[PDB]
Amino acid sequence: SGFRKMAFPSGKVEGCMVQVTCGTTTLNGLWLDDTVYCPRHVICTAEDMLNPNYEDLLIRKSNHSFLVQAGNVQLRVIGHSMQNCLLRLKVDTSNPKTPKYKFVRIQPGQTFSVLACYNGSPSGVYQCAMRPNHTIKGSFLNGSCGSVGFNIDYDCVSFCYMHHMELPTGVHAGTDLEGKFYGPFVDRQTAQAAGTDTTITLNVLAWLYAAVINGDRWFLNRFTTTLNDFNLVAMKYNYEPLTQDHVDILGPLSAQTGIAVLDMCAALKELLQNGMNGRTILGSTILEDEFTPFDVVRQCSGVTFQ
Amino acid sequence: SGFRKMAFPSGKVEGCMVQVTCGTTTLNGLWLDDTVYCPRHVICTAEDMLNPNYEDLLIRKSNHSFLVQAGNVQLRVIGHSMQNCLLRLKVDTSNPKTPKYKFVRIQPGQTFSVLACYNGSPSGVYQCAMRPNHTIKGSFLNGSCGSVGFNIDYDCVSFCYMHHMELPTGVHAGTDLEGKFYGPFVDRQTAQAAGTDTTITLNVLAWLYAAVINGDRWFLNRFTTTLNDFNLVAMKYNYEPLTQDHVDILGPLSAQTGIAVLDMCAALKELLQNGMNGRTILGSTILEDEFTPFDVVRQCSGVTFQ
Numbered sequence: 001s002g003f004r005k006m007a008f009p010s011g012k013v014e015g016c017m018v019q020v021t022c023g024t025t026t027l028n029g030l031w032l033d034d035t036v037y038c039p040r041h042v043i044c045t046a047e048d049m050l051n052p053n054y055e056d057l058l059i060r061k062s063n064h065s066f067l068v069q070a071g072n073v074q075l076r077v078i079g080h081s082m083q084n085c086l087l088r089l090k091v092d093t094s095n096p097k098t099p100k101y102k103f104v105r106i107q108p109g110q111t112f113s114v115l116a117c118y119n120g121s122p123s124g125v126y127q128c129a130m131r132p133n134h135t136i137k138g139s140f141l142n143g144s145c146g147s148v149g150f151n152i153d154y155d156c157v158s159f160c161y162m163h164h165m166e167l168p169t170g171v172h173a174g175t176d177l178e179g180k181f182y183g184p185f186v187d188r189q190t191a192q193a194a195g196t197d198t199t200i201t202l203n204v205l206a207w208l209y210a211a212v213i214n215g216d217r218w219f220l221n222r223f224t225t226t227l228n229d230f231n232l233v234a235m236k237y238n239y240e241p242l243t244q245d246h247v248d249i250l251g252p253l254s255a256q257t258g259i260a261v262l263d264m265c266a267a268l269k270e271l272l273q274n275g276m277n278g279r280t281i282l283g284s285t286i287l288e289d290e291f292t293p294f295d296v297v298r299q300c301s302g303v304t305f306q
Numbered sequence: 307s308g309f310r311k312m313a314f315p316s317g318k319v320e321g322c323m324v325q326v327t328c329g330t331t332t333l334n335g336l337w338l339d340d341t342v343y344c345p346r347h348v349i350c351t352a353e354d355m356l357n358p359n360y361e362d363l364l365i366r367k368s369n370h371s372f373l374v375q376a377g378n379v380q381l382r383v384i385g386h387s388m389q390n391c392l393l394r395l396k397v398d399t400s401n402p403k404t405p406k407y408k409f410v411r412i413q414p415g416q417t418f419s420v421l422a423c424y425n426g427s428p429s430g431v432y433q434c435a436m437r438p439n440h441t442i443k444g445s446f447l448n449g450s451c452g453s454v455g456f457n458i459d460y461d462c463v464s465f466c467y468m469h470h471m472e473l474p475t476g477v478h479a480g481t482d483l484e485g486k487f488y489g490p491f492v493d494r495q496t497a498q499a500a501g502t503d504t505t506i507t508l509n510v511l512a513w514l515y516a517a518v519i520n521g522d523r524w525f526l527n528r529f530t531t532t533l534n535d536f537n538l539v540a541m542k543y544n545y546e547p548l549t550q551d552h553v554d555i556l557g558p559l560s561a562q563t564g565i566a567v568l569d570m571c572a573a574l575k576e577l578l579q580n581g582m583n584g585r586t587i588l589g590s591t592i593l594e595d596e597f598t599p600f601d602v603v604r605q606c607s608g609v610t611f612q
């Protein structure tokens with residue numbers, strides 16, 4: 001029993017974190033096989049951030065413009081290239097701690113673990129969601145750029161995020177491990193801001209199923225809803241519209257608890273309209289949206305507490 | 307910016323997790339140097355849990371009654387002894403991944419990271435507090451016994467918890483790494499229940515200082531309080547009494563934000579009496595008590611957003 005915002009064990013990723021220095025500028029990088037990946041803003045001075053031409057900044061560097069430190073070991077850079085908003089540094093040594101890995105581009109609403117790093121040293125791990133507005137509500141200080149997000153499946157690390165920026169509202173923006181930003185953001189100083197965000201409906205439904213699995217039914221009711229009537233309520237409360245694909249994804253949870261998806265939707269409509277009236281769900285007074293249906297199945301018992 | 311329930315990176319502990327089997331009974335153990343530590347209930351059948359005499363159950367075992375599996379490697383047991391509610395197994399191999407470590411007995415209100423394990427395989431990591439009632443609000447399923455809690459300080463792992471039991475209210479009980487239970491609990495079937503719990507006052511004050519560091523002052527007020535007048539309010543709301551020692555611990559946070567501790571206490575008295583009136587603090591609608599003053603300093607900027 002219990003339900004916590006659980007991260008994946010971080011060891012497989014800790015063994016891949018290094019420090020990358022170009023002159024006075026330092027941040028973190030990810031060392032897989034004989035390549036180091038890092039934010040391309042490592043080649044900038046603070047003043048270069050105002051309006052950098054990365055092509056122009058990079059052609060002015062050599063291999064030896066870059067220092068890579070792995071623990072107390074200097075790695076020699078033997079090649080370099082830009083890939084979208086990342087630099088790829090070829091190094092003289094393959095990382096002997098390289099796990100089985102993949103690079104994946106996650107979708108909005110999906111969750112991942114972040115390993116917060118400073119100076120190539122891991123400091124902490126926590127679980128995030130990719131918001132609908134393509135930001136993450138992380139916890140990062142200056143020096144955290146190049147920190148990575150990931151999932152683990154059967155000893156394979158799926159890297160999905162590399163940290164680049166804190167936006168003016170204190171949320172975070174970054175790239176996949178091909179250096180494409182999540183959302184409309186750019187690695188230069190502009191008036192860019194986080195767009196309006198929405199609650200991840202699918203995740204709130206998954207977490208209601210988690211509270212039932214764990215033995216709580218108080219918020220259920222005798223009503224059902226149509227998807228259209230649910231979505232008129234969602235629009236009012238700044239919830240993502242629910243789709244048939246979302247209903248289908250909730251099938252396994254529905255089957256484990258014997259609660260039809262649209263009957264769970266009816267419960268959520270009533271929670272949104274009426275509020276929680278001093279009650280909690282899995283220890284929370286608000287409707288949590290940072291657990292996917294997959295996260296609930298990973299963490300909860302396969303046996304409902306009936 | 308941001309504030310998250312952050313765990314310590316788990317790698318140093320992942321490298322120490324093994325599986326311990328005595329007949330049909332399996333759980334996790336911790337492999338440091340040439341010793342494996344695990345809950346002594348590994349020597350029980352399910353029926354033995356009703357009223358086990360561990361001295362009597364153990365004298366009936368040999369070294370070869372115990373199988374220890376580290377990945378796909380069988381470790382041979384060459385000695386065994388009971389230490390309070392743990393078994394200590396001597397093995398033929400020193401763990402080459404043993405980190406610098408210590409065993410510490412933490413105090414109520416202090417936090418640690420849990421590495422949830424099944425069959426000697428780590429599955430997840432999350433941060434907990436030791437409740438005043440000597441339980442943790444973990445997330446554990448059957449098979450999780452022998453999972454450990456820890457802190458990390460400068461590459462030294464301080465082990466503080468080993469998982470033994472889920473109590474009837476779905477919270478968790480365990481031991482230090484000398485096998486002494488936290489709280490009044492015993493490793494046998496009794497009517498034992500979690501005692502009444504209280505909110506960790508010190509931690510709520512630390513988290514209010516975190517919200518100020520991160521740039522939020524909305525809940526502050528022009529009042530001050532005495533420690534006695536604060537504690538009459540604490541008694542009413544099931545908060546731990548605040549002590550002078552707690553005031554002294556908050557000195558560094560007070561100094562960083564320029565808010566006197568008793569002025570922060572006055573803010574908390576007003577939040578308890580009036581509620582949050584639809585507002586949030588660091589994204590929360592409730593007063594969070596699972597961050598210590600040390601956790602706030604670790605995670606937050608050394609520079610207040612003034």
Ligand SMILES: O=C(Cn1nnc2ccccc21)N(Cc1cccc(Cl)c1)c1ccc(-c2ccc[nH]c2=O)cc1
Nearest residue numbers: 025044045046049140141142164165166187188189307
């Ligand atoms: O948000 C960042 C870096 N950040 N990432 N999480 C953070 C959390 C807290 C504080 C800062 C953080 N920005 C701003 C930015 C502006 C424009 C484009 C981008 Cl992509 C990022 C940043 C600021 C300074 C520098 C810099 C470059 C060269 C030498 N020295 C430096 O400081 C780099 C990035």
Ligand SMILES: O=C(Cn1nnc2ccccc21)N(Cc1cccc(Cl)c1)c1ccc(-c2ccc[nH]c2=O)cc1
Nearest residue numbers: 001331350351352355446447448470471472493494495
């Ligand atoms: O709470 C546990 C084991 N637990 N720990 N977190 C859990 C989370 C979810 C479910 C069970 C969990 N109890 C109960 C208990 C009773 C009396 C004393 C203690 Cl100390 C623990 C437990 C139940 C069964 C067995 C058992 C022993 C031998 C062979 N097979 C078995 O199943 C061991 C412990």
